[PDB]
Amino acid sequence: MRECISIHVGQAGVQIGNACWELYCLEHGIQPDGQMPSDKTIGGGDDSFNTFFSETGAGKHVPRAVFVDLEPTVIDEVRTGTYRQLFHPEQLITGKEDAANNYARGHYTIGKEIIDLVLDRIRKLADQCTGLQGFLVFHSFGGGTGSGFTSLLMERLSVDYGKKSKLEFSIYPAPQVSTAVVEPYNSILTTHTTLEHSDCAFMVDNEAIYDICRRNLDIERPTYTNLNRLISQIVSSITASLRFDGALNVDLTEFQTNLVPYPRIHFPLATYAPVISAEKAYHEQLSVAEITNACFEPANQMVKCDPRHGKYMACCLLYRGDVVPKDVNAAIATIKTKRSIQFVDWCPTGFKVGINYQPPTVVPGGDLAKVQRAVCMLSNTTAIAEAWARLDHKFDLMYAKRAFVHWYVGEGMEEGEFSEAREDMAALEKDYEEVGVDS
Amino acid sequence: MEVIELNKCTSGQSFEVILKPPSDPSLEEIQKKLEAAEERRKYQEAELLKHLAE
Amino acid sequence: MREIVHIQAGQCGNQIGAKFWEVISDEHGIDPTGSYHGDSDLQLERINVYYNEATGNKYVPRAILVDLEPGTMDSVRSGPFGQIFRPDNFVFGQSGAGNNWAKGHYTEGAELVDSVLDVVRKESESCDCLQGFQLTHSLGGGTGSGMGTLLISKIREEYPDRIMNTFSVMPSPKVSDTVVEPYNATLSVHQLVENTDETYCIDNEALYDICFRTLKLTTPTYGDLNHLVSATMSGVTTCLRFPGQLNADLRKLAVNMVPFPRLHFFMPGFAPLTSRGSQQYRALTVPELTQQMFDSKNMMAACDPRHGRYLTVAAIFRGRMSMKEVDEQMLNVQNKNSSYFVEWIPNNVKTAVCDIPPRGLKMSATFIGNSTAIQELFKRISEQFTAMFRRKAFLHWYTGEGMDEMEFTEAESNMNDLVSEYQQYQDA
Amino acid sequence: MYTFVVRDENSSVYAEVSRLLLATGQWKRLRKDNPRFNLMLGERNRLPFGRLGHEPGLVQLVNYYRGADKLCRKASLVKLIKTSPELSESCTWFPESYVIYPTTDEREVFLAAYNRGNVWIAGILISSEASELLDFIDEQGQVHVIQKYLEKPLLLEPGHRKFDIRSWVLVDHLYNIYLYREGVLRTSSEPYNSANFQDKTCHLTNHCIQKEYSRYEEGNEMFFEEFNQYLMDALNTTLENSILLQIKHIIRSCLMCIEPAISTKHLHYQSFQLFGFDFMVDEELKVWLIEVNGAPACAQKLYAELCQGIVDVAISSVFPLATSIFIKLHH
Ligand SMILES: Nc1nc2c(ncn2[C@@H]2O[C@H](COP(=O)(O)OP(=O)(O)OP(=O)(O)O)[C@@H](O)[C@H]2O)c(=O)[nH]1
Ligand SMILES: Nc1nc2c(ncn2[C@@H]2O[C@H](COP(=O)(O)OP(=O)(O)O)[C@@H](O)[C@H]2O)c(=O)[nH]1
Ligand SMILES: [Ca+2]
Ligand SMILES: [Mg+2]
């Protein structure tokens, strides 16, 4: 058994954190006080679910995680909500002044001022770990902390834990819920600095989650709660394999082996289905064929983009519920004809499939209905570069006029770190173009 | 059209289905970079206090 | 919490400041004695941004009352809420400043200033997270104009890294008849360009035009003006005082509104406009609130917004309503008038909603625009200044305090620059 | 109100569209870089499809289908027909073609069928000899295609000259295939002379190279009522039966082949697009396809009508306001 540390950074990462950690608790049958009657290994055991929870001699199961906001308002809701008993005071790190949606502020000013306390607090968890494999980092691109501290922390982590894996769940900015206009600045900046320290990034575009909540759950004006609950389902599909008995995606190195042939193209597109309203009077259950096809409709992806215009370099199907290979292959067979699904030549046209027999768990009174089966696809398609092209364009419109630049410069950041960050993005978009988008 | 490495357990199954075959800086340099930023940040404030003291 | 130190100086300064306090004190449930008597814990949840905790569950405005003459001190101390201010926080001289910037900044204001800064230290020193200051003052007189901008220079020097916020009342010959106000205003604008992060431009031309035309106030008074200045102040500070996401501290506001350091002059706007004591018969529908708040008849700076381009814009909605509709309506605005927003700042309009409404309104909106069209206002002042500086007229009132022509030439040049700067960004 | 930007100032065709839209008080033209548009009249190359369909509050329409270039680039079209089971070598309305590269290559495979009457085509080079032909492109420095030059073209009279059929096809967001009723033959002025494969005059009907030499038709454009008449007076048939039946069949077969790859049915932006198909009638009245044109211009006579029809079926269909010139190709 090999443990993983979760690191939730900034408001978004921390609020998404409890969304996951709550769900995780429901799935493994853990209670708000760390108790898990089902575990009989009282005070330990190297069970698959220990990867995410450690055990206390009193029988409390404690997430292998640390949250860290540069301001206290959000984390205080974690040290007071239902699951306050469940975490450990020292894994909820907070500062006083935040980073005012300013990457440079959270990276340099205030970053420096609380990196070591974070790194230390993290080594604490690496010790009660017999074979730590790496970290999952949850953050937003747009905020001060989320963008600027995380990239700071990602570089100390490549120093402090060289042989360790780092995965990202990263929230791409959308104006329908964004609270800053400099967000493209912070997104490009933090992507650049972080690109070489992250083994695999899952970018959830707020815009995508938001329409999924509007169209499929009848929710008028989605709140962060709705968004964050849906993100916890998809996140739980990506991590189910690390906490349950399986042979596919058993440890974090396997994620980059399965999804990431090139190190820079490490942003797999996640696609999930079915997403049904709990209040739906009746819903005719969807079939393995029907859910698997849904995975090729752009309207279910965590990122609106067209994979028909782009090539694949990997694909994974993560089924939860009542699924058997016969149906899976059957369905593949048939979508293979109807849809346009070209891989790149130096890659086999093929799917890796995993099935967890236990259907998806829903937060009682949440927005999602229980479903007899569900699937998360993890395609690595070049089509996700669409997201970079549009973010880079917004960057270009503003930096041409130098709008807002003085806020980052005034914190010490040098104007050039803007152009070198952006130029790296152009490299990134160029590689995506070479690889895919040939035939 | 080719199921590979079917692995079964009481939690679920895992397999591969193929249809067609194929046709870093240092704590030193990190600190060298944070500090170049407070040196600029503190210089800017110097010049500002300097103006204000004029 | 992030605390804000409020300073209010001079006649104008001290009277819009007292009004602001009685309005937000109601909003937050504090009674004219400093004791909480509301319901919603949303009232108290951020109360310490603007108030201070004393034993008795009592709440003291973190306010400092400054003037070079005892008149206005005594009026406010004998106003409705005259009793809820830290009495050592009254700093006042005797001379007065006689509508003279140079006396507020240089000669009379000098004697008094350190006594003001002591209270500012004593207030700042007991802040866990001072975020900055907000000063209320006028720009056409002598104390608030001249001593206000001096205090701002002295405050930035002790707190170079806290935010500086001013509500600055601009002079208009529709409401005043002192000939030297264009001098005081240009000397003060020159200071504000260099030393404040965010300045709201409460223009007395706009305040008079609203009151006289729109509200049909035949014989308006400063209490009528100050009624518009009261609602606006409550509006643009909602995001600091109740729980929320957007523009919820002075820095985060600035990073959202100020794309270049000098262009930090804001054009406010309120809907619905109301004469005080106006019986409110109907609520505004969300599309009504939206249309009006963007309308020129509704600005607090007499500038044609269609004569420029919006650099950035913040919209605050208050009262129980539909975010689904606010969001629909705010989008439609930018979509049907899309050239009036610079295309080189994407998504430059941020919208907040506060469920708690202001007093006597079920529904209001408050608009904060950073529009290049505010060059019209500085231009108005600049042309009055020039008219009489080109003949060094009335200059003796100033050179006899030890000022020197050269200063007037500088303040004028920096403002003429500010205008050309706003104009270059009108063309992209 | 609706908003459009313009980003190809060389479109005779969508210059008419923007002119019409404006002339309604219901359409304003933003500046190309303003993102807050409903309609993008879109550039010819590297049009930023990635950026479309993300403005909330706005419904966005663009006048191209991402990936319609497969139909509209000669080397790609070939590969499209050859590979797509819907078309394949079962295809009998496409001249026999291969893709060749200067200095997936079908050069060996080309000669393979080159054997013993054999004339082919690549301005461009026509010749009945592999040498001089293959090496022409083998130097050229631009990938080109080798297509069997049709030796027995139907030739109009009086003249004994070859022509060229242009049909305009509009495909809206629903993937309705509209065929504009009026088409044009691009006629040759110099009587088509066999053994002149290097003449490039009588042999080529390109409106350009014909305006160099030219008589019977105003600017070498014959329209359908005249061509129908001639087809009746000689030949004894209709334009409908002999030719247009094949044409409607080729437009439908091509556009649907790619429909799964460019349909915007369930997409966050909508496409429509105007295609110009280029056909060749031959001696036995059998239609052949050559160019599909992705940004076609229009015969001067017909601009008024087609361009209004584009606005009508393709743009107003999506953005409404307050007999039909097209033939919907049913599928
Ligand atoms: N989907 C989603 N996005 C969120 C949530 N919370 C915050 N965000 C996004 O995250 C962005 C800022 O991220 P952070 O850098 O972490 O901001 P923060 O956590 O407040 O930390 P500071 O920026 O230092 O104040 C905001 O613009 C939001 O759009 C959430 O709960 N769900
Ligand atoms: N809008 C507004 N303007 C005011 C108010 N009180 C004074 N003023 C303006 O301030 C100017 C006088 O400035 P003054 O009070 O003498 O400045 P001070 O001596 O430095 O305090 C007049 O021209 C008025 O237009 C007020 O309550 N509201
Ligand atoms: Ca057990
Ligand atoms: Mg924040």
mmCIF file of C-alpha atoms in Angstrom, chain A residues 11 97-98 100-101 105 175 178-182 210 220-221 224 394 397-398 401-404 406-407, chain C residues 2 129 162 245-246 251-252 254-256 258-261 312 323-324 327 343-347 350 428:
data_model
loop_
_atom_site.group_PDB
_atom_site.id
_atom_site.type_symbol
_atom_site.label_atom_id
_atom_site.label_comp_id
_atom_site.label_asym_id
_atom_site.label_seq_id
_atom_site.Cartn_x
_atom_site.Cartn_y
_atom_site.Cartn_z
ATOM 1 C CA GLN A 11 -10.095 29.311 -1.813
ATOM 2 C CA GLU A 97 -3.486 38.927 4.218
ATOM 3 C CA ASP A 98 -4.385 37.139 0.983
ATOM 4 C CA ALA A 100 -5.438 40.070 -3.938
ATOM 5 C CA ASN A 101 -5.848 37.978 -7.137
ATOM 6 C CA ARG A 105 1.939 38.721 -4.660
ATOM 7 C CA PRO A 175 -16.145 34.912 -16.198
ATOM 8 C CA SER A 178 -14.608 34.697 -11.860
ATOM 9 C CA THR A 179 -14.036 37.532 -9.371
ATOM 10 C CA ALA A 180 -10.993 39.109 -11.101
ATOM 11 C CA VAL A 181 -10.182 40.468 -14.550
ATOM 12 C CA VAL A 182 -6.432 39.757 -14.264
ATOM 13 C CA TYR A 210 -21.486 25.625 -15.026
ATOM 14 C CA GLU A 220 -30.834 28.415 -12.609
ATOM 15 C CA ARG A 221 -27.656 30.199 -11.441
ATOM 16 C CA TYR A 224 -19.961 27.172 -5.987
ATOM 17 C CA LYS A 394 -7.027 37.196 -23.505
ATOM 18 C CA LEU A 397 -5.182 41.670 -25.549
ATOM 19 C CA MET A 398 -4.270 42.985 -22.085
ATOM 20 C CA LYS A 401 -1.556 47.636 -23.496
ATOM 21 C CA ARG A 402 0.300 46.643 -20.308
ATOM 22 C CA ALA A 403 -3.038 46.806 -18.480
ATOM 23 C CA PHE A 404 -2.630 45.852 -14.815
ATOM 24 C CA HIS A 406 2.141 47.402 -12.602
ATOM 25 C CA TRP A 407 0.384 45.400 -9.854
ATOM 26 C CA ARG C 2 -9.284 43.814 7.489
ATOM 27 C CA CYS C 129 -5.074 43.760 9.406
ATOM 28 C CA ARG C 162 -1.696 50.136 2.896
ATOM 29 C CA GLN C 245 -16.724 37.240 -3.170
ATOM 30 C CA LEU C 246 -16.048 40.308 -5.201
ATOM 31 C CA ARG C 251 -6.768 45.974 -2.510
ATOM 32 C CA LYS C 252 -8.883 43.460 -4.410
ATOM 33 C CA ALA C 254 -8.077 48.268 -6.806
ATOM 34 C CA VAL C 255 -6.617 45.312 -8.677
ATOM 35 C CA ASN C 256 -10.012 45.019 -10.457
ATOM 36 C CA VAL C 258 -7.174 50.235 -11.838
ATOM 37 C CA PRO C 259 -5.445 48.995 -15.024
ATOM 38 C CA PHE C 260 -2.891 51.833 -14.859
ATOM 39 C CA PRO C 261 -1.769 53.615 -11.651
ATOM 40 C CA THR C 312 -13.306 48.615 -15.832
ATOM 41 C CA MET C 323 -29.089 36.377 -9.794
ATOM 42 C CA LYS C 324 -30.308 34.492 -12.864
ATOM 43 C CA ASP C 327 -26.744 38.037 -14.736
ATOM 44 C CA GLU C 343 -11.969 45.199 -26.113
ATOM 45 C CA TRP C 344 -8.390 44.984 -24.774
ATOM 46 C CA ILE C 345 -9.601 44.307 -21.240
ATOM 47 C CA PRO C 346 -11.726 41.175 -21.540
ATOM 48 C CA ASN C 347 -14.616 40.636 -19.160
ATOM 49 C CA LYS C 350 -17.818 42.358 -12.303
ATOM 50 C CA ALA C 428 -7.029 51.394 -29.305
#
